Design a protein around this ligand. Structure first.
Ligand SMILES: [Mg+2]
Ligand SMILES: [Zn+2]
Ligand SMILES: [Zn+2]
Lengths: 49, 1358, 50, 79, 98
RNA sequence: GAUGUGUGCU
DNA sequence: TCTGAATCTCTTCCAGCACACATCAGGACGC
DNA sequence: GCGTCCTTCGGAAGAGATTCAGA
């Protein structure tokens, strides 16, 4: 996977209701991950490493 | 020797009894002269001597000093074999927690003290204090105190009050616990409290306390005080090449644990500060945790290469544990392995071994006979003579190899026929020659696969291989009544080319006196093999009681069939070869030969078919050229028509008539229709386009094109492969199961573009990545199916009952997929069947109906036979022979004492794996049907529309408004003949009662987007539909019409989730309309993706469409994508929307209105009426406020859940539902599986039965116990004056029912070894070694087959 | 030299092996004609023309 | 000279008791000196046992009565 | 490849795996079901008790085969004793009754 | 003896 | 404010056999 | 040449623990 920013979807099988989430990934060449993602309650939660 | 295995907790006194010494130093072999250290993990004083019968320091050397213990080093001189039997132990300075009783989830410590897991792990890993002996303060006996809170408690209450921390505190908590007082207090709380969740928690804790107080265990033993070590011989440090040693995991873990323990003891001896000793206690606890069960904590420690090392649990659990790697299967001596070749000169009882493999296999036999004849003198001389391969050894090898059968075995042994016994025939080379007649059973193609040989050593093994596992006695597959030795791929082609006719020959109209002159003609070349002559044959018949009566006739046959008649055994009618013998034809011929004559004529005739197929296939020269696949001259017209129609679909969806998913559903429809048209057109052009003259004008015959021969005979091929060789290749599927929108338009005979090849790459990769990555979840199915049915074995001759499932021939939407004959054959009837000569019985009550009886039932046109099922048997720990039927491999009733659970599980579990490693054979084609949307009835008769709620349309014709309908066509006799499933919102051109003529159309609909319809017309008001909040509304400005799409529960607003879209019907005055029959309003709810193209308050007619919802009917529908359904059925998954049933009978009416959602109360007219139910507003109710409902009727619609159907409609209904669904799933791919195996699995489902009321039994109220135990207890009580205990059958999945088996060794070996072993140690269980896997692990005669008599003797002897 | 099995052509759809067989037969026929014309020594004109 | 045991199974209809009784007979014939009732044709003891089964002049009943008689006569021979 | 009596493993008394080592084929977990299915119990008992696993019966059967006496005397598989010892290494007490 | 890679048949 | 239903979170599982090659085993620091 | 030592990344499902809501 090329280093950069990736906007994954995680469509479907989560939450058992079809509610599509949205998670943003910043993969570095060397360092720590900076995963942004949403929540079923429409909250935007960051998660590093 | 022994007859039980007991599992329980280990006491420190008991561990010291196991202990033979005290290891206290982490010193392995000293990196020097390789001697064990003084007090290390390896030591002769602690465990035992290194070399046999030798002291460590060297004070004694031979057996004449056995028993004494040396003085200088204190070691005993004894056997060196005892290094794997004599355990050591460690005296820990501080106690530690055993994780298996801490993190099992359910955590035993967690629910034993009713304090949560988090508090316990914080206490045991030193993050907070805990309270013991609260005493005269406000602190409770289980309160959690942090560091600051503990400091406060000491500065204010530094009295005799104590508050420990860590493993010592938990040990005090467990030691100071009184089991009886807690048990009676919890009993009082259970009797008092009415809530159900706290009731379940309390009864779980009561179960745990009862398990403790029943056995000899005590709660304080669950905290480790002494840690036994594994014997050194089971953790060897093998001396590698050089000075280094092996990096054995257990040695490193024990070194770390001993390091922590010794350092902690040293610090405790020097009175270290409390924080340092607390940290070191934490280190000791985590080290012991990593040693016991590594990886269950947050981080798994590693020694080198950053790889999670294995502890004492990774080698007991999992795929690489001892149970699955070294107990249920072991590497085996006297075995070999080589690539196989054909050698078609063999017979069914013969194989071909290489001359060099047999010398290494049968080496002890050669040694024995060389010593017997005196040609050698000692063992080593014979060894040298064999290694020098003298001429005498080769002579005597032919003596031992004579009639000593071996086990030919392939690597994937899917079913019972994976191991067959053959006699060996010594040949040169290095290849294992295999008889091709069993290669279809083996699934052993000759493309480089390796088979494995095995040598029965003992006498009984050879006799079992001769009488049971011999390939001669294995000509009937256990899956069904069809034979498994079917000629294929050369013999079928040879026979089909021989048994065929064309109108010309060297001699055609001549007459012959028998087969011999036909052979003379064909060998001399004076008459072709496809002549049409009239020979004089003598076919035999056995109308008498076993005597063959002669007859001679003059039949009009070919030369080839006359030649073939020479090998047919005396006794079969001639009307079996007088046709074009394909593959199914000769399969039926072999089947009827077995049914009529027997076994020896059948095997001799099979060998003769082999020979006469190979010879006349070699002589045929049925080659294949590039001029044999003929391209039809009208396929491009079909692709042009399909292109025009899909171009129409383009305008259809871009305008807005259909959406993207609907466009995708219709484009696959039209492409599949075009593919099916091209295939049929090419097939006709390739099978009939031939011209020949009969000495006059031209005449048409069945074509002699080579491809047609090998596609019609069925030797190897089908419609798919040849269809893709000429004409249309079709449309392929992606690995996820979706189908490509564009089918490539070309064939392999003309070529492919550089882009159509890229598109076909999708299907080509789909096939391979489907095989290699989804045969895993089909081998898992057969693994956990063999697991759940291993302990089921026939045990009795007859259970003697009248219960039995009801058997009907099924017609589920087409013609008769399977008739009565194929369905009831070889199963004992349950009661006197009534023929339609009523008041008289046709077949007796307990006769195993064979083929003659099947013909008799077919003659009298019987449609309803009550047959005995294996699920309704009444025996204990097994099933009687009469409730099963025939052996399905032999032509007789099954023999008592045969493991049918294994043959049932394997038969169910290896069409899936086999066919999922076959989807790449056809390439990558989707093979999806055309999804017909019309009803073309063919047979003549009347209609019986059962459970149909139809309404009148604006055109006046009937429209169905029900989901569980089925249109059955019944002929003039009244017997059932046809049955079609009409869908929701379908219009009918006919009805019920009218005699429908054969060949008309009665029902029409639209395949995609089944529409919701209305009963009563009027104006519709857009209720609870505001644009944006719950509906996406798009409108064209010029015209001004609304064509909206509703949202799901997914993309809708969170606040607006309580808003539910629906269409309400109102009149001109806006008043409430009513459903015909009731006074409730017409509230038609709308599901997701519902499109509406109307306006509020428009005038419509009764019985019209209102909205459309896409179906997304997309998928390749192969066995790869299409069999998670079998897993769902067998593990009994609750469906997403279960259709609610009527749990009790009586009148139906509502009670309270909107207790959050709708409510309904069922009240009987005589009994009590305490039943209420909660109805979410999602599903409309098919019943109203004023009808009578019975037990099992569907209140709403949807798939049935395989729990309520059992608990309401009984065992027979749920077993029939499971059987029918699995049978339809398997028959969708052409597989033929006998239903007995599925019924066996369903019976294995029903072993648990919760108690309703205690009655006079000793079982508790809500305890779940084996159904066999309940039945035995009730039968024993009924013999006395007491009353039996009422129960109810539960239905747990195969995994759930296997994990809760009474014999804990089976569950421990299968899955979740930690969670099962911990439960068995807590409960103090005692295994009886009753099933098959338990005796396999122990290593005894399994009570399954030949060892069943020995097991009976051993059981009845005590 | 080798007697293969015809049924390995249709069921596994490797039709290209038949075309390779035909083209190899044509190639070996041309080679056989060249070998024949070279066996009895003819002038370079005929070989070049062929 | 043996291809299948269908006739033997027709003699004793268990298909499993047959294996045990044939094993007992062949064990009697091999390690001991008991002579076969059917003249062998250079065959392994298993098929001599099976051939004794198929001609009908042996079964479990015959074997255990013969063994009981042999035990009685050998214990009476001590006198 | 073929294998008579030969080398054996160390932690469990079973034949080695491979061809470079003189090792035999594996009658695996799926293989045993194909023998329980037939009901051929005695041959299965030789394939996992006396031919591979145990130590005393392994030599006794070899002597019986080169003595003219085809008979098997099963003991206990050593791999089951290994399982018993590895379970007793934990806090669990598994044992054999009388 | 265990890991890593490649490969054959399903 | 107690108590079921829904949701969050933790754990288990993922085909069989065989063959070939490689490394690897404390490796860091003091002597 | 010896010798002694203190990364993340699956996904389908089941179960046991929380939160919610709701009457
Ligand atoms: Mg293959
Ligand atoms: Zn000594
Ligand atoms: Zn029965």
């Amino acid at each position: 996977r090329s280093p950069g920013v990736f906007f994954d979807s995680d469509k479907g099988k989560t939450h058992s209701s079809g509610k599509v989430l949205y998670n943003a990934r910043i993969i570095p060449y060397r360092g720590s991950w900076l995963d942004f993602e949403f929540d079923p309650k429409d909250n935007l939660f960051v998660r590093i490493d | 020797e022994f007859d039980a295995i007991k599992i329980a907790l280990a006491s420190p006194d008991m561990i010291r009894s196991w202990s033979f010494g005290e290891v206290k130093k982490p010193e392995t072999i000293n990196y020097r002269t390789f001697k064990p250290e003084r007090d290390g993990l390896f030591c002769a004083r602690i465990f035992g001597p290194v070399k046999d019968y030798e002291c460590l320091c060297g004070k004694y050397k031979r057996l004449k000093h056995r028993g004494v213990i040396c003085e200088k080093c204190g070691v005993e001189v004894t056997q060196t074999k005892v290094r794997r039997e004599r355990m050591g132990h460690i005296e820990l300075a501080s106690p530690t927690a055993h994780i298996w009783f801490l993190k099992s989830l359910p955590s035993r410590i967690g629910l034993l003290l009713d304090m949560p897991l988090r508090d316990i792990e914080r206490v045991l890993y030193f993050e907070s204090y805990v309270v013991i002996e609260g005493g005269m303060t406000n602190l409770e006996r289980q309160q959690i105190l942090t560091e600051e809170q503990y400091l406060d408690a000491l500065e204010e209450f530094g009295d005799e009050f104590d508050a420990k921390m860590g493993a010592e505190a938990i040990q005090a908590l467990l030691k100071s616990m009184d089991l009886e007082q807690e048990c009676e207090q919890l009993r009082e709380e259970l009797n008092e409290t009415n809530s159900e969740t706290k009731r379940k928690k309390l009864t779980k804790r009561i179960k745990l306390l009862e398990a403790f107080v029943q056995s000899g265990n005590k709660p304080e033993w669950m905290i480790l005080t002494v840690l036994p070590v594994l014997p050194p011989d089971l953790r060897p440090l093998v001396p590698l090449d050089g000075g280094r040693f092996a990096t054995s995991d257990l040695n490193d873990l024990y070194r770390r644990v001993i390091n922590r323990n010794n350092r902690l003891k040293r610090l405790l001896d020097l009175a270290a500060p409390d924080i340092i000793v607390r940290n070191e206690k934490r280190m000791l606890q985590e080290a012991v945790d990593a040693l016991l069960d590594n990886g269950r904590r947050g981080r798994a420690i590693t020694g080198s290469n950053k790889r999670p090392l294995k502890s004492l649990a990774d080698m007991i659990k999992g795929k690489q544990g001892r149970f699955r790697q070294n107990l249920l299967g072991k590497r085996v001596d006297y075995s070999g392995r080589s690539v196989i070749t054909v050698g078609p000169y063999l017979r069914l009882h013969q194989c071909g071994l290489p001359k060099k493999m047999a010398l290494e296999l049968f080496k002890p036999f050669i040694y024995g006979k060389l010593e017997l004849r005196g040609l050698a003198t000692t063992i080593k001389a014979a060894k040298k003579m064999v290694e020098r391969e003298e001429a005498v050894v080769w002579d005597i090898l032919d003596e031992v190899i004579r009639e000593h059968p071996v086990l030919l075995n392939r690597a994937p042994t899917l079913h019972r026929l994976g191991i067959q016994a053959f006699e060996p025939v010594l040949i040169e080379g290095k290849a294992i020659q295999l008889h091709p007649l069993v290669c279809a059973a083996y699934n052993a193609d000759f493309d480089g696969d390796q088979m494995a040989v095995h040598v029965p050593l003992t006498l009984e093994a050879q006799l079992e291989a001769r009488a049971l596992m011999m390939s001669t006695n294995n000509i009937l597959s256990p899956a069904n009544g069809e034979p498994i030795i079917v000629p294929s791929q050369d013999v079928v082609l040879g026979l089909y080319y021989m048994t065929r006719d064309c109108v010309n020959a060297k001699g055609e109209g001549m007459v012959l006196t028998g087969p011999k002159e036909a052979e003379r003609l064909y060998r001399s070349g004076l008459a072709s093999l496809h002549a049409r002559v009239k020979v004089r044959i003598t076919e035999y018949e056995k109308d008498a009681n076993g005597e063959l009566v002669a007859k001679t006739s003059l039949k009009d046959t070919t030369v080839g069939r006359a030649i073939l008649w020479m090998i047919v055994p005396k006794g079969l009618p001639y009307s079996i070869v007088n046709q074009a013998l394909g593959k199914k034809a000769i399969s039926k011929m072999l089947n009827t030969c077995y049914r009529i004559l027997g076994l020896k004529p059948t095997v001799i005739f099979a060998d003769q078919i082999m020979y006469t197929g190979f010879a006349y296939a070699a002589r045929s020269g049925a080659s294949v050229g590039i001029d044999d696949m003929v391209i039809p001259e009208k396929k491009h017209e079909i692709i042009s028509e399909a292109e025009a129609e899909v171009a129409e679909i383009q305008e259809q969806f871009q305008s807005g008539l259909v959406t993207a998913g609907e466009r995708y559903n219709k484009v696959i429809d039209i492409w599949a229709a075009a593919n099916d048209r091209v295939s049929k057109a090419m097939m006709d052009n390739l099978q009939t386009e031939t011209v020949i003259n009969r000495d006059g004008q031209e005449e048409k015959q069945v074509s002699f094109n080579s491809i047609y021969m090998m596609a019609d005979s069925g030797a190897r091929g089908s419609a798919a492969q040849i269809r893709q060789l000429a004409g249309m290749r079709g449309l392929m599927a992606k690995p996820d199961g979706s189908i490509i929108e564009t089918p490539i338009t070309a064939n392999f005979r003309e070529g492919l573009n550089v882009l159509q090849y890229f598109i076909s790459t999708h299907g080509a990769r789909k096939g391979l990545a489907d095989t290699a990555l989804k045969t895993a979840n089909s081998g898992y199915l057969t693994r956990r199916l063999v697991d759940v049915a291993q302990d089921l074995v026939v045990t009795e001759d007859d259970c003697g009952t009248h219960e039995g499932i009801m058997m009907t021939p099924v017609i589920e939407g087409g013609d008769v997929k399977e008739p009565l004959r194929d369905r009831v054959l070889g199963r004992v009837t349950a009661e006197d069947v009534l023929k339609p000569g009523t008041a008289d019985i046709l077949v007796p009550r307990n006769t195993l109906l064979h083929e003659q009886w099947c013909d008799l039932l077919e003659e009298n046109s019987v449609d309803a036979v009550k047959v005995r099922s294996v699920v309704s048997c009444d025996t204990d720990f097994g099933v009687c022979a009469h409730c099963y039927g025939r052996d399905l491999a032999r032509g007789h009733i099954i023999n008592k004492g045969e493991a049918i659970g294994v043959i049932a599980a394997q038969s169910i579990g290896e069409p899936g794996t086999q066919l999922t490693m076959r989807t790449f054979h056809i390439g990558g084609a989707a093979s999806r049907a055309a999804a017909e949307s019309s009803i073309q009835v063919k047979n003549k008769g009347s209609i019986k529309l059962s459970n149909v709620k139809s309404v009148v349309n604006s055109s006046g014709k009937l429209v169905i408004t029900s989901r569980n309908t089925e249109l059955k066509l019944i002929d003039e006799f009244g017997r059932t003949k046809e049955s079609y499933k009409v869908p929701y919102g379908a219009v009918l051109a006919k009805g019920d009662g009218e005699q429908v003529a054969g060949g008309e159309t009665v029902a029409n609909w639209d395949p995609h987007t089944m529409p919701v319809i209305t009963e009563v017309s009027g104006f519709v008001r857009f209720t609870d539909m505001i644009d944006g909040q719950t509906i996406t509304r798009q409108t064209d400005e010029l015209t001004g019409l609304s064509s909206l799409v509703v949202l799901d529960s997914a993309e809708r607003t969170a606040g607006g989730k309580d808003l539910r879209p629906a269409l309400k019907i109102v009149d001109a005055q806006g008043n409430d309309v009513l459903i015909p029959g009731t006074d409730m309003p017409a509230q038609y709810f709308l599901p997701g993706k519902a499109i509406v193209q109307l306006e509020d308050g428009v005038q419509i007619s009764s019985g019209d469409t209102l909205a459309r919802i896409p179906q997304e009917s997309g998928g390749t529908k192969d066995i790869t994508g299409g069999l998670p359904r079998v897993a769902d059925l067998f593990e009994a998954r609750r469906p997403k929307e279960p259709a609610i049933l009527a749990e009790i009978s009586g009148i139906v009416s509502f009670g309270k209105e909107t207790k959050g959602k709708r409510r309904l109360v069922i009240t009987p007219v005589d009994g009590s009426d305490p039943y209420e139910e909660m109805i979410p507003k999602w599903r409309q109710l098919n019943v109203f406020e004023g009808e009578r409902v019975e037990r099992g009727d569907v209140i709403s619609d949807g798939p049935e859940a395989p729990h309520d159907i059992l608990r309401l409609r009984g065992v027979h209904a749920v077993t029939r539902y499971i059987v029918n669904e699995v049978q339809d799933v398997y028959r969708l791919q052409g597989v033929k599986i006998n239903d007995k195996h599925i019924e066996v699995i369903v019976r294995q489902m029903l072993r648990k039965a919760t108690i309703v009321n205690a009655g006079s039994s000793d079982f508790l109220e809500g305890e779940q116990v084996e159904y066999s135990r309940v039945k035995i207890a009730n039968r024993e009580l009924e013999a006395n004056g007491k009353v039996g205990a009422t129960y109810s059958r539960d239905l747990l999945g195969i995994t759930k029912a296997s994990l809760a088996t009474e014999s804990f060794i089976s569950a421990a070996s299968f899955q979740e070894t930690t969670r099962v072993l911990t439960e068995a140690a807590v409960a103090g269980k005692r295994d009886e070694l009753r099933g098959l896997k338990e005796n396999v692990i122990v290593g005894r005669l399994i009570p399954a087959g030949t060892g069943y008599a020995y097991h009976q003797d051993r059981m009845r002897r005590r | 030299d080798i007697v293969l099995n015809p049924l390995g052509v249709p069921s596994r759809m490797n039709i290209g092996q038949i075309l390779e067989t035909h083209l190899g037969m044509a190639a070996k026929g041309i080679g056989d004609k060249i070998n024949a014309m070279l066996k009895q020594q003819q002038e370079v004109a005929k070989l070049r023309e062929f | 000279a043996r291809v299948t045991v269908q006739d033997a199974v027709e003699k004793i209809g268990n298909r499993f008791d047959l294996v045990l009784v044939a094993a007992r007979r062949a064990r009697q014939m091999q390690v001991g000196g008991k002579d076969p009732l059917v003249p062998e044709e250079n065959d392994k003891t298993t098929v001599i046992a099976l051939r004794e089964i198929e001609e009908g002049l042996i079964n479990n009943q015959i074997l255990d009565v013969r063994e009981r008689q042999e035990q009685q006569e050998q214990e009476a021979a001590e006198l | 490849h073929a294998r008579s009596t030969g080398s054996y493993s160390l932690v469990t008394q079973q034949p080695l795996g491979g061809k470079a080592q003189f090792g035999g084929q594996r009658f695996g977990e799926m293989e045993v079901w194909a023998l329980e299915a037939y009901g051929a119990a005695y041959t299965l008992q030789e394939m996992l008790t006396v031919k591979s696993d145990d130590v005393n019966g392994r030599t006794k059967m070899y002597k019986n085969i080169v003595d003219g006496n085809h008979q098997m005397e099963p003991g206990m598989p050593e791999s089951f004793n290994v399982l018993l010892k590895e379970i007793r290494s934990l806090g669990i007490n598994i044992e054999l009754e009388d």
